[PDB]
Amino acid sequence: RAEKTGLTLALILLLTFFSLIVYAAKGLKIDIPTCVTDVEPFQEGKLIKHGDKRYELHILARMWYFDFNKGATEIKIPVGSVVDIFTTSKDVVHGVHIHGTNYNVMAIPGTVGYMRIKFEKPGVYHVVCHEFCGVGHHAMQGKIIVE
Amino acid sequence: RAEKTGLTLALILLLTFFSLIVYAAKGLKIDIPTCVTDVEPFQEGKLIKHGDKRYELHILARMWYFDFNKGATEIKIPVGSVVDIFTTSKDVVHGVHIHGTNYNVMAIPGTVGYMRIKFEKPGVYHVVCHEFCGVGHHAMQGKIIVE
Amino acid sequence: FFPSGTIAFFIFMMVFYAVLWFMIYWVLLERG
Amino acid sequence: FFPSGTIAFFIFMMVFYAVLWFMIYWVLLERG
Amino acid sequence: VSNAIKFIILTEIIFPTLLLVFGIYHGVMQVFYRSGIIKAESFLGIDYYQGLTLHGVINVIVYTTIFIVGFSNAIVAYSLKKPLREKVQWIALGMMVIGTLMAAWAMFTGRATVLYTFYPPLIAHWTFYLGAVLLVLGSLVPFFFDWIPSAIQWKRENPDQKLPLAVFGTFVNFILWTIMIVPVAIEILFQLLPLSLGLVDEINPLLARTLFWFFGHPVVYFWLLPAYVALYTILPKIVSEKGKLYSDPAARLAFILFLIFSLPVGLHHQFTDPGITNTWKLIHALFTFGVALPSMITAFTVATSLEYSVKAEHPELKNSKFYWWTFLPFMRLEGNKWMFSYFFAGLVLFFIGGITGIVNASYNVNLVVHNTAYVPGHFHTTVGGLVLLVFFALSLYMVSKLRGSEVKLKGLAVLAPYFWMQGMFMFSYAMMVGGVVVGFPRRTNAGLTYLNPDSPLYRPEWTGYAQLAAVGGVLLAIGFAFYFASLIATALAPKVRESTLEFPIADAYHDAPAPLLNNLKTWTVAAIILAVLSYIPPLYDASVRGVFFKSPAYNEKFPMGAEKKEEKKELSKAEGGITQK
Amino acid sequence: VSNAIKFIILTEIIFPTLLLVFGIYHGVMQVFYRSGIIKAESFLGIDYYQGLTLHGVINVIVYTTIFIVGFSNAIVAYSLKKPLREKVQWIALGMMVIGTLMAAWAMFTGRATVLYTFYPPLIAHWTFYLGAVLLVLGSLVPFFFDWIPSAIQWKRENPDQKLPLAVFGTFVNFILWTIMIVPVAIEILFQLLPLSLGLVDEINPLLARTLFWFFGHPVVYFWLLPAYVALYTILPKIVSEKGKLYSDPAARLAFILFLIFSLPVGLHHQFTDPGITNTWKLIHALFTFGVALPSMITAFTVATSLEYSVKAEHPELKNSKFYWWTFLPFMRLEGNKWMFSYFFAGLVLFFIGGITGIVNASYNVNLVVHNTAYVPGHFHTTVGGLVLLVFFALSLYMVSKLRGSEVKLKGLAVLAPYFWMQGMFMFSYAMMVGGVVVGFPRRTNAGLTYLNPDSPLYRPEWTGYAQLAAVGGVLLAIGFAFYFASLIATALAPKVRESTLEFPIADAYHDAPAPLLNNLKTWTVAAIILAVLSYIPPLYDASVRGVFFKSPAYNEKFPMGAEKKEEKKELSKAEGGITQK
Ligand SMILES: CCCCCC/C=C/CCCCCCCCCC(=O)O[C@H](COC(=O)CCCCCCCCCCCCCCC)COP(=O)(O)OC[C@@H](O)[C@@H](O)[C@H](O)[C@H](O)COP(=O)(O)OC[C@@H](COC(=O)CCCCCCCCCCCCCCC)OC(=O)CCCCCCCCC/C=C/CCCCCC
Ligand code: HAS
Ligand code: HAS
Ligand SMILES: CCCCCCCCCCCCCCCCCC(=O)OC[C@H](COP(=O)(O)OCCN)OC(=O)CCCCCCCCCCCCCCCCC
Ligand SMILES: CCCCCCCCCCCCCCCCCC(=O)OC[C@H](COP(=O)(O)OCCN)OC(=O)CCCCCCCCCCCCCCCCC
Ligand SMILES: C/C(=C/CC/C(C)=C/CC1=CC(=O)c2ccccc2C1=O)CC/C=C(/C)CC/C=C(\C)CC/C=C(/C)CCC[C@H](C)CCCC(C)C
Ligand SMILES: C/C(=C/CC/C(C)=C/CC1=CC(=O)c2ccccc2C1=O)CC/C=C(/C)CC/C=C(\C)CC/C=C(/C)CCC[C@H](C)CCCC(C)C
Ligand code: HEM
Ligand code: HEM
Ligand code: CUA
Ligand code: CUA
C-alpha cells in the first residue's frame, strides 16, 4: 500500500536517530548521569586529583547559591583540565547547568550526580540552575572560571 | 467619495506624526546636528568646562579608532554630567554612534558635528562607528565610561 | 459601487503605523 | 485511490526532522 | 439532548476556558517577566513563580482534564446515540469543580507556589494536593459509571458491530488515564498529602519525581488522544462533505499504540536525574521513539483523509501531488469550515512539536536542552498548538450546536488560529534557539537578575532571545482574545433553533472489522504488563540503591519501599477491573 | 514583436537576474558574516566590504536600472502598440552591458570596495565611476530616442485621447530619472572621476554626500514607479478577468505626486550630517511626509481595484468588508495567477517598508535608527519586498510570453514569494529590533569583532539579534533559489507557440479625461523648479558655510562652488529639454 511506505519511512528515520544516539552514548562517551555510590556524604568540596589536568569537583548546591569551594560561588581551574564533577543538593531538587559544556544534571537530595567533562576552551563557564528551588532562585548561579 | 476618506485619514496621520516630531525637536530640545562654526581646527580634546556637570568633549575620529583624550579610546566622566560633544573626523566620513544616548552624528572631514547630551544613568556608553571607513572598520569603537 | 473594504483596511493601516512609529518615537524620548 | 500526496508530504517530514534533530545533535557533539 | 446534560457540557466547556483566561493572562505576563521588561518580582500581587504555578496548573490540569470529560460526554453520547446519565454527570462535575476551586484557592493566595509538577521536597498546602487529586480522580466517575455501561449495552445489543471510532478513541484515552492515575494518586496520597499537614516528616525526593513522570508523561497522550479523535472523525467532514477518513483500521491501530506505548515512556523526562540507573533511561528513550510512531501514523492517516476529502470534491485535482493543500478551506467561514482554521493551525504547530519532542527524547541530546527554554518550545507547540486549538474549535462548535447560537463573530474565530500559530512561531522560535545556544533556562524569573543590566548576575547574551519573544507573547495574546470574544459572543446569544448534540463524524473510507485490535481487553492487559515491566528497575532505584537519606519539606521562601510495591500491586491488579470492564 | 527586440528584452530580463544571483549569494553570506558564524574577514576571496559593494551595486544599480529599461521597452511598445526601434535598443543595451561589466570588474577584483554609495573621500577605481555613470546614462537613450517619439507620434495621431496609464507611468518614471541623473552625473564626473586618476587632489566630502542623496533618493521612487505601473495595470487583471483598476485619475494623480515630490526629498538621508543647516532638514522631513502620501493613495487605489475585481467575480461578496482578501488567488497556478503570489507577498513587505520609511524620515526619530540595522529593514522590505518581487513576477511572465514557453516549474514559482516574504520577515524583524534597542550598526563586519566572544570589542547583547536573523537569510536564499529555478526552466525550453509581447492590462473602472494632470509639461516644470528651490540651501552649505577645507582621497586599506552652480544651471536648463519633449 502507501501506509507501508509511510511506515518504512518513519521507521528508517527513527532507527537512524536511535542508532546515532546510542553511538554517541557508547563511543565518544557522552554519558548521561547514572547511579554512582561509594560513600558520598557530600557537603564540601574540591580536589586537585592528578595535578595538572584531572580534578574532582564537588558542587554542593545549597538553597539559592552553589558551593564550589568552601563557600565560594566562583572557582578557577587551569585550561584543558578534565574535571570529575559531582553534584548533590543540600535541601531541595536543584538544577546544575554548566552553560559551556553539556553538563546538565539535577542535584536531588540524597543523590550524587556524577559526570566527567573537560574544559578544552578557556573562558568562564556559568553554572546556572534551572529547576525551581523557591524564591531567590533567579539569583542562583556561579562561575567556573577557566583562564 | 471614499478616496477623500482615505486621504483625510492619511493626512490626519501624517500631520500627527509631523506635529509630534516638530514638538519634540522644539520643546524638550532634541536637536538634530546643525551647522556650528566658531574656529574648530580640531585634532585633540576634552575640557572640564563648568566643573561638576558641564563638559566639552572633542571626539576626533581618526581612521580606525576614536580619540577621546590625547589618544585614549576610552574616557571616564562623572554621573549626571551634561557633555557638549563635538565630532570631526581626520580623514574620511566616520559615524559616531553613542549607543546609550541618541547621539548619532557623522564626522565629515572639515565639519564639526555638535550635539549636547547628558549622561543621566551611569554605566558604560560604547561609541561605535557605523558608516563605512575602510577595512579595520569593524574594530573601531571606544567607551565613554560614566561610573 | 462603494469600496467599503479598503476604508477599513486603511483604518487598520495608520493604526499599525502610529503604533510602530510611536514605539520608535518613545525610544527617542526615553534616550537621554 | 492512491494517497500519492501524503507520501511526498512525509518525504518532506523526516527530512525536516533529521535536519532539526541533526542540528541539535551537532550542538551535542560540539559541546565539550 | 437532555436539559441538564446540556448544562453539564456547557459548564465543562465554559468553566475551563473561563479559567484558562488567567492561564493565558499570566502566560503573557511571563513572556514579559522572562524577557526583562516587567522586571521587579511580582505584579498585581501574583509573583512570578506563583503565577507560573497557575499558568501551568490552570492550563494543563484544570483546563484540559475538564474539557476532555466535557467533550467526551458529548462525543460518546452522540456516537453511541445514548442519552447520558444525569445523576452521574452531576457528581462528576461537582468533584471536578470542587477540586479545581480547592486547587485554585491556595494557589492564588500563595499557599502552593510549588509548581505545576510539585517537585518535592518543596511541598504545598494540602488543599493543593487533595484539590488536584480530587479534580483528576473525579473525571473517572463518568468513564466508569456512565459510558462503560451504555457502551457495554450498545455493544451487546448489535452485537456484531465494531465500536465507533469516536468512542473507541475515548475508551483508549480513558483506559490510559485510569491506568496512569495510579502513579500520581499514589505519590500524592502517600508522600505529599502525608508530608503536608505533617504526618510523615520525610520524603524520597527521587521516588516522588519518578511516580510523577509515570503520570506526567501519559497525560500528554491523554490530552493528545481527544485531539486525535477529532482529527480522525471531525476533520474529514469539516473539509468537504465527501470526506471519508481513509483507513479506519489505521486509526484504530494508532490508538492501540497510544495505549501500549504511552505508559512505559515516562522515564525520558528525568534523563538527567542521578539516581535512576542509566540503561533504563535508554530503554525509555527507545519506548519514546516507539510512542512517537503512532503520531507518525496519524500524520499519514489524517493527511490522506485530508487528501481523499479534497480530491473528492475536486475531481480535477485527481492524481496531483502538492497542488491540493491549496484547495483546503484555510480561512473559510460559513458552516463547519471555520474549524479547519483551528485544525490546520494546530497541525502545523504539531508538526514542529513533534520534531522537538523527538529531539528532546534522544537521551544523549537531552543534555543539550533539558530544562532550557527549549522544552517550552516543545510543549507549547504540542499542547497549545494542537491540543489547545482543537479544543478551542470544538468548544466553539459545541457551545454553538448545543445552545442554538449559530456562531457569533465567526470571522474573529477564523482569524484566531493564525494569530495563535504565528505568535507561537515568533515565540517558540526565539526561545528554542535561545535555549539551545545560550542555555536560557526554564522556570526562572530571568528578567529580574539574569537580564537586569545592573545585577551582578547579568549574562548579556540572553537579552536578544528574550526580547524577540515578547512579540510572540503579544501576538498570541491577541490570538486568544479573538477566540475568547468569539466564544463569549457564541455562548451569550441568541437561541435560534433546537439545542441538539450534533457532530460531523466522517466515516471510514477503508473499513475493516479487524478483531486483533478492536479488542481493548488483551491490549489493556498488554499496556498494564508493559509499563510495569518497565518501571520495576527505576522504582527499584529511587527507593533503594538510589538514595542515601530522606528529606524534610521546604517551603518556597525559607531554607527549612512499600510506597512503591503498593503502586505496583495496584497497577497489576487494575487488570481485574479493566477486564471485567 | 520583432526578432531582435525580443533578444534585447530577453537580455535585459536575464542578464540582470543572472547578475543578481551574486547579489543574493553575498546577501546570504552577509547575514552570516554579521551574525558571527562565518567570522574571519573574507570568503572565497571576496572580503565583507567588497562583497557588500557587490550586494549593493549589483542589486540596486545594475539589476533594477536594467530590468526597468527592459520591462519599459516591453510595456511601452505594447501599450502604444508601436514597434520598438532596434538601432536604438541596441546601443542602449550595449552601453548598459559595457557599463555593468566595467563596474563589476574593478569591484570583483577589489579596486572599488568603496560601497554602493561611494561616500567620498573614499575613492574607487575610475572604471567603477565611469562604469556606473555609463550604466545609468545609457538607459536614457531608449527614453529620448525610442519612445519619446512613437509616443509623440501615437499621441498626435489620435489626437484626443489620454496617454495610456502604462506608458504615462513610464513617462513620469523616466522624467524623474532624467532629472535625478543630473546630480550624480555631476558629482561623479566632476568630483570623483577627477579625484580618481588624480587630476584634482581635493574633494568636498560633504558636497559629494549631498549631490548624492539628490540621486540616491529619487532613485527609490524611480524603481517604485514601475512596480506601481504593474500594481495598477497588471494586478487587477491577474486577479479575475473582470478587474478594472478603480479610479484611473487617482493613479495618474499618484504618478504626478511621485513626479513633483520625489525630487526635493533627498536631504532626509543625511539628517545627521553636521554641515547642512538644520531647518532645511526639517523642510525635507516635511517633503518626505509629502512623498509618502502618493504611496498611501496607491494603497487605496490598488486595494480597491483588488476589491472591485474580487467582488466582480463573486457577487455573493457584495457589500462585505473583510471577507474578501480571502477569495484572492494567493497560491493559484494556472494562468496569469501565479503572479498574484508575487504581487501580494510584495504588497505585505511594502506595508512594512512604508511604516519603516515613515519612521526613518521623522527627522527627530532618525537619530534612533540612522545607519543602525533598522535601515536594512526599511530598504529590504521596500526594495526586495515589492520592487524585487514585482520585477520577479514580470520577469517570469515576459520571459514566458515573448519566448513561447508557457511557464515551467510554476509551482516552485508560486511558492517563491512566500519563502521570500517569510525570510524577509524573520530577518528584518530581528534586525529592526536589534538596531533600535542595541544599536546594531550597519555596514559592519560585526561578526569578526563585535560578536567574537574573544575579541576585546565584544558587545554581547548583539548576539541574539544577529543569530536570529541567519534563519531569515537561509529562508530567503531558498525563496530566491525557487524563483531562479523557475526562471531558468522557463527561459530554457520548449517553444510551443508564437512569441508575442502580451500583457494583462486592466482598464479604468472610473475613467476621466482630466487635463490638469495628463499634462507632463507644466508638471515636469513644477518638479524641476521645486527640488531646486529646495536644494539651494543645502548646496549653499556643503559648498560654503559648511566646510573648512577639502580632503584628499583615501583608499579603503590605508590611512593616506562652480561644482554646484553647474548642476543648478543644469537642472534649471533641463526645462527646455523636457518641454520641447
Ligand atoms: C506582528 C509582529 C511583527 C513581526 C511578525 C512578522 C510576521 C508577520 C506575519 C507574516 C505573514 C503575514 C501575511 C499574511 C498573509 C500571507 C498570504 C497567505 O497566507 O496566503 C496563503 C499562503 O500562506 C503562507 O504561507 C504565508 C505565510 C507566511 C509565509 C510562510 C513561509 C513558510 C513557507 C511557505 C509556506 C507556503 C507553502 C509552502 C510549504 C512548503 C495561501 O493560502 P491558500 O490556501 O493557497 O489560498 C487560496 C485562496 O485563493 C482560496 O481560493 C482558497 O479557497 C483557500 O481555501 C483560502 O485561503 P486563504 O486565502 O484564506 O489563505 C489562508 C492562509 C492564512 O495565512 C496566514 O496568515 C498564516 C501565516 C502565518 C500566520 C500569520 C499571522 C499574521 C496575522 C494573521 C494573518 C491572517 C489574516 C489576518 C490579517 C489581519 O492559510 C495559511 O497560510 C496557513 C499557513 C501555512 C504555512 C504555515 C507556516 C507559517 C510560518 C512559517 C514558519 C515560521 C517560523 C520560521 C522558523 C523556522 C524556519 C523555517
Ligand atoms: C499533549 C501534550 C504533549 C504531547 C502530544 C507531547 C508529545 C511528545 N513529547 Fe512531550 N516531551 C518529550 C518527548 C515527546 C515526544 C517524543 C512526543 C511525541 O509524541 C511527539 C510525536 C509527534 C509527531 C512526531 C508529530 C508528527 C505528527 C503530526 C500530526 C504531523 C502533522 C502532519 C502534517 C502533514 C499535517 C499537515 C499540516 C502541516 C503541518 C503540513 C520529552 C523528551 O524527553 C520531554 C522532556 C525533555 C526535557 O528533558 O524535559 C517532553 C516534555 C513535555 C512536557 C514537559 C513538562 C514539564 O515542563 O517538564 C510537556 C507538558 C509535554 C507535553 C506533550 N508532549 N512534553
Ligand atoms: C524602492 C526603494 C525604496 C522605496 C520605495 C522607499 C520608500 C521610502 N523611504 Fe527609503 N528611506 C527613507 C524614507 C522613505 C519613505 C518615507 C518612503 C516612502 O515612500 C514609503 C511610503 C510607503 C507607503 C506608506 C506604504 C503604504 C502603501 C503600500 C502599498 C501599502 C500596501 C497596501 C495594502 C492594503 C495592500 C494589501 C496587502 C497587505 C499589505 C494588506 C529614509 C528616511 O529618512 C531613509 C534613510 C534613513 C537613514 O537615516 O538612512 C531611507 C533609506 C532608504 C535606502 C537607504 C540607502 C542606504 O542604505 O542609506 C534605500 C535603498 C531606500 C529605498 C526605498 N525607500 N530607502
Ligand atoms: C514537481 C516539482 C518538485 C520539486 C520539489 C523540490 C523540493 C526541494 C526541497 C525544498 C522544500 C520546499 C518545498 C517546496 C515545494 C515545491 C513544490 C511546488 O511549488 O510545486 C509543486 C506543487 C505544484 O505542482 P503539482 O501539484 O504537481 O501540479 C499539478 C498540476 N495540475 O506545488 C503546489 O501547488 C503545492 C504546494 C503546497 C502549497 C502550500 C500552501 C499553503 C501554505 C503552507 C503549506 C503547508 C502545508 C504543506 C506541507 C507540505 C509541503 C509540500
Ligand atoms: C465585524 C467585526 C469587526 C471587529 C474588528 C476588531 C478589530 C480589532 C483590532 C485587531 C486587529 C486585527 C484584525 C483582525 C480582523 C478581525 C475581523 C474578522 O475576523 O472578521 C471580519 C471578517 C469576516 O466578517 P465579514 O467579512 O463582515 O462577514 C461577511 C459575511 N458574509 O473577516 C474576514 O473573513 C476577513 C479578514 C481577512 C483575512 C485575511 C486572510 C489572509 C491572511 C493575511 C491577511 C492580510 C490581508 C488583510 C489586510 C487587512 C486586515 C483586515
Ligand atoms: C532546532 C533549533 C536549532 C538549535 C540551534 C541551532 C541554530 C544550532 C546552530 C548553532 C549551533 C552552535 O553551537 C553555534 C555556536 C556558535 C555560533 C553559532 C551556532 C549556531 O548557529 C532551532 C529551530 C527551532 C524550531 C525548529 C523553529 C520552529 C519554528 C516554529 C516553532 C514553527 C514554524 C515551523 C513549522 C515546522 C512550520 C512547517 C510548515 C511549513 C512547511 C512551513 C515551512 C517551515 C520549514 C520547516 C519548511
Ligand atoms: C519597530 C520596531 C520596534 C522598535 C523596538 C521596540 C520593540 C521598542 C520596545 C522597547 C524599547 C526600549 O527602549 C526598551 C528598553 C529596555 C527594555 C525593553 C525595551 C523595549 O522593549 C520593531 C518592529 C519591526 C517591524 C515593524 C516588524 C515587521 C515584521 C516584518 C518586517 C513583516 C511582518 C509585519 C507586516 C506589517 C505584515 C502585516 C500584514 C498582516 C496584517 C499581518 C499582521 C501583522 C501585524 C502588524 C498586524
Ligand atoms: C497564550 C500565550 C502564552 C504565552 C505567551 C505563554 C508563555 C509561557 C512561557 C514564557 C512559559 C515558560 C515559563 C518558564 O519556563 O518559566 C510558559 C510555560 C508554560 N506554558 Fe505557557 N504561554 C502561553 C500559553 C500557554 C498555553 C495555551 C498552554 C497550555 C494549554 C501553556 C502551557 C504552559 C506550560 C504547561 C508551561 C510550563 C509551566 C511550568 O514550567 O511550570 N502556555 N508559558
Ligand atoms: C535574499 C536575501 C538577502 C539577504 C539575506 C540580504 C542580506 C543583507 C544584509 C544583512 C544587509 C546588511 C549589510 C550591512 O548593513 O552591512 C544587506 C544590505 C543590503 N541589501 Fe541585501 N540581502 C538580501 C537580498 C537583497 C535584495 C534582493 C536586495 C535588493 C534588490 C538587497 C539590497 C540590499 C542593499 C541595497 C543593501 C545595502 C548595502 C549597503 O548598505 O551598501 N538585498 N543585505
Ligand atoms: Cu537552586 Cu533553582
Ligand atoms: Cu570609522 Cu567606520
Residue numbers in the entry:
A (entry chain B), B (entry chain E): 3 to 149
C (entry chain F), D (entry chain C): 10 to 41
E (entry chain A), F (entry chain D): 6 to 565, 572 to 592
What does the original paper state about this entry?
Cytochrome c oxidase (CcO) is the terminal enzyme in the respiratory chains of many aerobic organisms. It is located in the inner membrane of mitochondria and bacteria, and catalyzes the electron transfer from cytochrome c to molecular oxygen that is reduced to water. The cytochrome c oxidase from A. aeolicus, AaCcO, was previously discovered belonging to B‐family HCO, and interestingly could use both cytochrome c and ubiquinol as electron donors, which is a unique feature as a member of B‐family HCO. To gain insights into the molecular mechanism of AaCcO and also to understand how AaCcO adapts its structure to keep stability and activity under hyperthermophilic growth conditions, we purified the AaCcO from native membranes and determined its structure at 3.4 Å resolution by using single‐particle electron cryo‐microscopy (cryo‐EM).
We found a dimeric form of AaCcO with a novel binding site of the native quinol (VII‐tetrahydromultiprenyl‐1,4 naphthoquinone, NQ) at the dimeric interface, which could allow NQH2 to be a direct electron donor bypassing cytochrome c. Surprisingly, subunit I (CoxA2) contains 14 TMHs, two more than the canonical structures of CcOs. The AaCcO dimer is formed via interactions of its major subunit CoxA2 while this is not the case for BtCcO. Interestingly, two quinol molecules (NQ) are found at the interface with the head group orientation towards the P‐side. Each NQ molecule is deeply buried in the hydrophobic groove formed by subunits IIa and coxA2. In particular, one carbonyl oxygen of NQ is found to bind to Glu39 of subunit IIa, a residue presents only in A. aeolicus. To be noted, the NQ tail is buried inside one protomer while its carbonyl oxygen is proximal to heme b of another protomer. The edge‐to‐edge distance between NQ and heme b is 15.0 Å. Thus, only the K‐pathway does exist for proton transfer in AaCcO. However, structural superposition of AaCcO and TtCcO suggest that only one oxygen diffusion channel exists and forms a V‐shape in AaCcO.
